[PDB]
Amino acid sequence: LPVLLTDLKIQYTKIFINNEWHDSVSGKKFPVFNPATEEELCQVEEGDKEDVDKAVKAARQAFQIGSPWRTMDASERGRLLYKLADLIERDRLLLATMESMNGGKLYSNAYLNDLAGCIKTLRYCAGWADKIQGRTIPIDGNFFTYTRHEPIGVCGQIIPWNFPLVMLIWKIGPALSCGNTVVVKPAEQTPLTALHVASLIKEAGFPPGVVNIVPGYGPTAGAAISSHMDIDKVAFTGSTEVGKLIKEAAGKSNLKRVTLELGGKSPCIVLADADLDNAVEFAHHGVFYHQGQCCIAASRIFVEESIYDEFVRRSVERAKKYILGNPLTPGVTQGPQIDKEQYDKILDLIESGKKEGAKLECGGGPWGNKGYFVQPTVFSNVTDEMRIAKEEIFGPVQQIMKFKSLDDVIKRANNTFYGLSAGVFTKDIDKAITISSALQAGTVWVNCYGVVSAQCPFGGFKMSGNGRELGEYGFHEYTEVKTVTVKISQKNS
Amino acid sequence: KIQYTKIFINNEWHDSVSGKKFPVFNPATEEELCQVEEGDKEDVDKAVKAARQAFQIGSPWRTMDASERGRLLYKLADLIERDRLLLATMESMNGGKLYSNAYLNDLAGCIKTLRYCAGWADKIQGRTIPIDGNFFTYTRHEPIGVCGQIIPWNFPLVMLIWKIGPALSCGNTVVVKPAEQTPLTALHVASLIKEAGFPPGVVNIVPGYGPTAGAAISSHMDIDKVAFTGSTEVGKLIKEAAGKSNLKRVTLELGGKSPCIVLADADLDNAVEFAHHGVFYHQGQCCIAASRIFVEESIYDEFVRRSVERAKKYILGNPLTPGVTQGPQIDKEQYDKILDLIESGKKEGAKLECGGGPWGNKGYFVQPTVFSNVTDEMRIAKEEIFGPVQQIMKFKSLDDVIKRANNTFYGLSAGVFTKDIDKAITISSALQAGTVWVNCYGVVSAQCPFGGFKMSGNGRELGEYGFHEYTEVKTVTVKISQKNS
Amino acid sequence: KIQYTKIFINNEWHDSVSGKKFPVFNPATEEELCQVEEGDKEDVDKAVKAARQAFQIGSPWRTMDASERGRLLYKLADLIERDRLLLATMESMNGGKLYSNAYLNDLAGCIKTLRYCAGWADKIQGRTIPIDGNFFTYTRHEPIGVCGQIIPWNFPLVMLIWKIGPALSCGNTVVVKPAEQTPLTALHVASLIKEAGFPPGVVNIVPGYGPTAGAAISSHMDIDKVAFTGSTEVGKLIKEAAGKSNLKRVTLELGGKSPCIVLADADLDNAVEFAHHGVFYHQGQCCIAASRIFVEESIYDEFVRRSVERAKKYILGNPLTPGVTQGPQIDKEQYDKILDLIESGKKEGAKLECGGGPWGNKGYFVQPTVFSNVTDEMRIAKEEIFGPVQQIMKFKSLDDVIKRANNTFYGLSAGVFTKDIDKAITISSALQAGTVWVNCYGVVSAQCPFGGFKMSGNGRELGEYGFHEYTEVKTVTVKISQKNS
Amino acid sequence: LPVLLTDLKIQYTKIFINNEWHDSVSGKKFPVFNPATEEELCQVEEGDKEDVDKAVKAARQAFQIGSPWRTMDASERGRLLYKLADLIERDRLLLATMESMNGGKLYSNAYLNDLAGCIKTLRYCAGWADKIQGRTIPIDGNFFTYTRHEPIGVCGQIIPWNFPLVMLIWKIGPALSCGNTVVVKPAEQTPLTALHVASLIKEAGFPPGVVNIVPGYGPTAGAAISSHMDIDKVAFTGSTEVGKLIKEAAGKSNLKRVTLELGGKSPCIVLADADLDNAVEFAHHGVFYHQGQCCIAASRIFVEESIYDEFVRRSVERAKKYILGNPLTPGVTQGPQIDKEQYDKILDLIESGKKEGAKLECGGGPWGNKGYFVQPTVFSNVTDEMRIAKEEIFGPVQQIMKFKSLDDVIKRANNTFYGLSAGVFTKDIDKAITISSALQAGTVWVNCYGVVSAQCPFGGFKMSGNGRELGEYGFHEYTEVKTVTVKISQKNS
């Protein structure tokens, strides 16, 4: 049961460099608002290329051969990450309340889900710390060859605003586990929890400069990170347009490694032989979790004809019960979106869906005078041609298309440039495996949705990202392989 | 013809130390083909001496390239494919295996296993450990040494390959002791091993009798590993001998009574066909025989009716004849034991449905016998038969039938038939079996590992699991000046 | 004080079925601390019943999350760190281990092993196989079941952790049988296990005597695995019992006579210090003792001269005293055997250099004895001593000394000292030892696996190698409609 | 012993699409010359964006779910690759003669080193075919999660000219092993062996469209491949500038995966306690193998103060004996370079080194009236500031710098933006491991050089490439991970 708490005091608003808090060299500060009330919470230091460089220099110094972080035992890095997780669990109340106040997130999920996944992921990576290993290779000839999975180096990391803490942890878990030093750039919407976790990183005992944080804007600080020459990798999570921009900036400068996590118009096929109650509930959760501001949101609910009507009749009823109010309230089940821009975008896309001809089965429009709230919306009889059926809405808008044959739905779901996720709802053994094989998605769920843990990898296929995270897969993308071959007197099998 | 009936050591053929020769009989007509030298303690000792000379540091084999070992294995597989017809006919005659089963399933499987183990030769790898302190630690996979391999008669060639291919791919020297019933295929494969280009002494064969030759291999001090694939009593006797001498590594693959759990949602045609095959494949002398074919009540009477019908179409005849789908058994002892088990099942009240007795005084052929209404205290459902005998038991609840299938000391394999994702996953995890099939049975391939959960097995095969069994892990730690991530 | 001296079953303390209690003696003064219940066949049976109830499908432990299992193990490690002082003092008193060795090396190593095995809980994974045909095949790592663990006295806590941490991380229920000499630490750790929050029946302890309790564990039908870490005779007696009952899995870690090969190019100071430590660490009762410390001729007389000098500075006294670098032995039998071995070495002509006899009638203390000019037929170089006895042998050629070091039935570990890359790699790859150190000795860590190459062990530990030992592999093949790459 | 060669007949000069030979839709044909004699060998069809597109269409069709290549067993793909290797071993004579005639490569190394490496790599990948495996993940909650390492899709591949056959095999080994369909674009200098191997691919029995080959130019066909939207990955090997261009073209469109293998300026540190004969011989081989046209060429030979003068004295002697004639002639040890462009570039860089002040101790000028021949050149007293000490020469020009302390040499070797390789020559156990750890290179050799086998991975750290090849590592690059999660009734440990 979450303790309500209902209070905060944001004493951390600076740039975290060299285990120290510095104002931006420019001196500017930008405001961070509260989505529920639109009131400024505080003024966070505004970093830019100069501050990004001042942070990358410290990171590079921390990564020098002979520095504590390099001569640190892998088990010691794991122990430091575990102590950070313990410190976060100690401050789970404050961090959850900050996430709900500043990210507009429901406090119940901010405490029970997001903070929980944060500690779980931090502990998973702390465990992996001293278990990533190389291989001794059976090379031909009298040679002894092995591989070192060394840290890549300086890894700039660009966090989104939808899951500030969870994504911060997803980034600085594998990176610090594998021995790298990072310069994180958090979203301007949600820069506060990252700074508190930065203070916690200092407290846990990480060497100075191992983790630095630069709050700012994407064009100024994110672009500086992605174009920096002294940065060895960039790991960006966000929109596909900024993903292409990050890839470009990396390719132009110092040919760094790039790891993009982009959006997706994920489908949710619901076959005739599906558990209608479970299918309906999980479709609702998939498309409406976190005000639809989830990269894996089920934005294309395919339903077979034989069960279409029922499904709609049961989806609307599920979307009509969705309480919507102040996040710090137990009865509230939907909160404000993030800020004005996404709120307006969701409203505009709702209007576009209405115009195109998609049956508005649930109320599409604002709720309340104060805050960026949108009514849970449902569209029926949607077709693949409509904008709402092709563009990532990132809002609480549910599309419901109808199909007849299975191969038709396979083609329709694979007929897109997004490949982040997909869902299949059936009781059969053949349909499940067939559709899971045929669906071009980096994570196919069967009879569930939104099921992510630190263990299994997460990523996209076509344009929904590059590489994977969350596991051995996620860790091998934060290491550079070095083959060391030694000429030896004689080799025996 | 059989031009190889001797002891294969140092790439050369030798007669037994005693000079004794035992006969090999074709069960289809019991006309002995040739006399094969009887391996005894002295023959085992000299074969092991040859192998240990071949494994010595600096020898051609130890200094050979793992890629070159795989290339040698691929050469051996291609030569075996060249003479596929001869080996197929010789296996079918010696063991009675149906010619279609001996050619399209046995030799193809041997080739696939050899070409898989050949592929794994230079890809098996050790690991570099991030140890604590200023040390550089790494581990390496080394061949263990001499591998005494005991290959009973149900699958002579396939088991010989399952035994050597992993061993010759991991870089071990094999002293294979075949079955007295079917020793000829191993000898011909040894001749093909010589043709392929293996260094002398890498592969040695010592045909004989298990009580004398196999026991000698299992007790030998210089045999690093013993790998037996056969009866559980013999596996118990090999394990106790292995511990007493050398604390040698032991890998025992024993047969088992394996359930096939059929549910109402299962496709009845596929379920019937696969339950038929999983028990009558290779005339029942299969370590994976589906001996406890459970069925749901709702289709119980509908299953047997169809199942029995299939048993009535199972043509019984000489293996080389076309249109025949079954052959004779391996010898007279198995014939007598099969008839004894059938009589015991009749006595204990197992309702016979079809067949149920011997046939064809010419040979060791047995009619496909289908029982019914079998229970869990009968000795035809708990005693391993190794014969074409089906036991169509019954159940009503899923947890109780799971406890039934797991109510046994035998866990080599299990089967499940269900059109429901939830049921399939629940049953496969629940059953205590090394291989749990779903909607199919006996789908064995070189990639998927093979072992047994209970007394039925020890260790794994056929994959990256079957290649860490033939190797030792040697850890090397070096004190370095200063370690960096 | 010792508030835990009973049998730990179902998270509760029980007295023995017979009611008998055996004594535990501190070797430093031989004043018995407390009486510990004697585990017998009935106590082993009830502990195994508790464990098998804890391992049942649907139980809290089986349905627990692997990540949650790791979290439980981390809680256990943190609690053990909370009471580090109590456990360190209790280990030092009960076993005589030096307090510095008991605190800064024993408890720290226990914590590191627990926090490594905790990390491996949810990262061990099975694999999806590209099988042939229209089938989907995958494999999974299932805990094997009940793990009867026999933990002799040289490293009670470190070995108990090396035994359970892997088991509780792979999801197995442990019935640990400690050493009669040092059973108290296991009981206190079981109390801390209760405090941590393990489900009842996951961990059970049955202190007693090996001939009665350990044999009962090794012969029990429901014990899936037996893991013994001690003398080779007992290892052989456990292996033969293991095969006879249940065909249970056997993991034996036995001590060995391990060489330390010192060459002229080696740094003489480091070589002397590490040869000293590798044999006199923990007063010689170390399974890895560097018992065959070879030396090159060019520095031979220069090595002993310095080596002996170090032995003369080795302070001998009560473990809890500061400035002491050695403690007493484990009991009177080891004392008598150490003196017998010293007398035999003197009789056979091993040139004594320093010490060479008992000391301190108060306790079981022994002077550090350094022999010299030892050879390969003497019984102080081929018989495992488990005492502070060094055997400074000699060699001239590299191949012959390699054959010497490999001239033995014991291969647990080996050592090499050389400032030459080529020599280091050549010797490391040449030796038939499962852990070859270079320029160092006894650098053991939870990451690097540990095992024996010969009769000095079987299986591996401490790493992914030591976590596939506590698990089975279950293949699961599903017939699918159409497979695509 | 190379089997003596016979006169050639180049009967394969077209575009290989759908297991068929088609002229370029434009109809143009470009000439391929013989570097030793500058005579045109034949006119190879000139592909462009249109031919690349009509090849990618066939590749995509071959990759469709339900096509033979998709329903092919992994063991069957390995069997087909093994049959291709058998065919190449059968035609080893012709292929080696073609490689030597068209690539200017010595026939002895073309037959013993290059063709042997090709068959070994093809057989290694054919072995891996059905052994690349996913993982069943221990996900939290009652879920059954596993992973499929599916083929990425269409993989455009751009081969260089220095190792035509070896690089063609390095590309189409892991790709076809993991189940992908490829559109290879070979260098215009060396397009002939690729086309013969294409005919061999057809003969072995690969399904139509699985492998297609488009001979053309980098700006026209290579850029088309790297900018195609229907292509899922691009794997380019060549210069760093074109690597940046490939990364850009991938980032601008399709957000495809990119694998670059670029050049390097690799150091070869020779310490005082080194086996001077072996060190000198291997330095010569490293810098002069394949007329210096090796990506891993030892272009910076660091020598310690104590053994410098002697090292120069014997390096000059070793380089003075390097017989230099027509490749097909036995006893020749150096041949023509590739074509006029690289010949002129090497001459210009030699002149720049002369002007800067590096002492020319051997060679340093053209050779022969016919053919692109350069005398083995040796520079001494080089400094890190000179152009020859910073720019990849790619010719038979040897640089020899002097150092005193090991720290100095570590920094100097790590003072470049290239990270492809490095070499260390010492007898000690501490120096070897220390320098191998400290040197920022994707392949450190100790007391040897140029030691590459199919097993161990190959790649570069900073700007010498992205990712790795040649082993399980190469395979991870060529597969997309798909996590399939199924909600189950109950899960047990």
UniProtKB/Swiss-Prot annotation, chains A, D:
Identify residues that carry N6-acetyllysine: 83, 120, 244, 345, 359, 402, 411, 427, 487
Upper lineage is:
Eukaryota, Metazoa, Chordata, Craniata, Vertebrata
Pathway, according to UniProt?
Cofactor metabolism; retinol metabolism
Q: How is its activity regulated?
A: Inhibited by citral, disulfiram, and cyanamide. Activated by diethylstilbestrol. Inhibited by duocarmycin analogs.
The record's region (Mediates interaction with PRMT3) falls at 328-493
Principal localisation: cytoplasm
Reactions catalysed, as given in the entry: an aldehyde + NAD(+) + H2O = a carboxylate + NADH + 2 H(+); all-trans-retinal + NAD(+) + H2O = all-trans-retinoate + NADH + 2 H(+); 9-cis-retinal + NAD(+) + H2O = 9-cis-retinoate + NADH + 2 H(+); 11-cis-retinal + NAD(+) + H2O = 11-cis-retinoate + NADH + 2 H(+)
Q: Keyword annotations for this protein? A: Acetylation, Cell projection, Cytoplasm, Lipid metabolism, NAD, Nucleotide-binding, Oxidoreductase, Phosphoprotein
Which EC class does it fall in?
A: oxidoreductase
User: Which family is this sequence assigned to?
Assistant: Belongs to the aldehyde dehydrogenase family.
Give the protein's recorded name: Aldehyde dehydrogenase 1A1
UniProt modified residues of type Phosphothreonine: 329
UniProt key word Cell membrane: no
Q: What is its EC number?
A: 1.2.1.19, 1.2.1.28, 1.2.1.3, 1.2.1.36
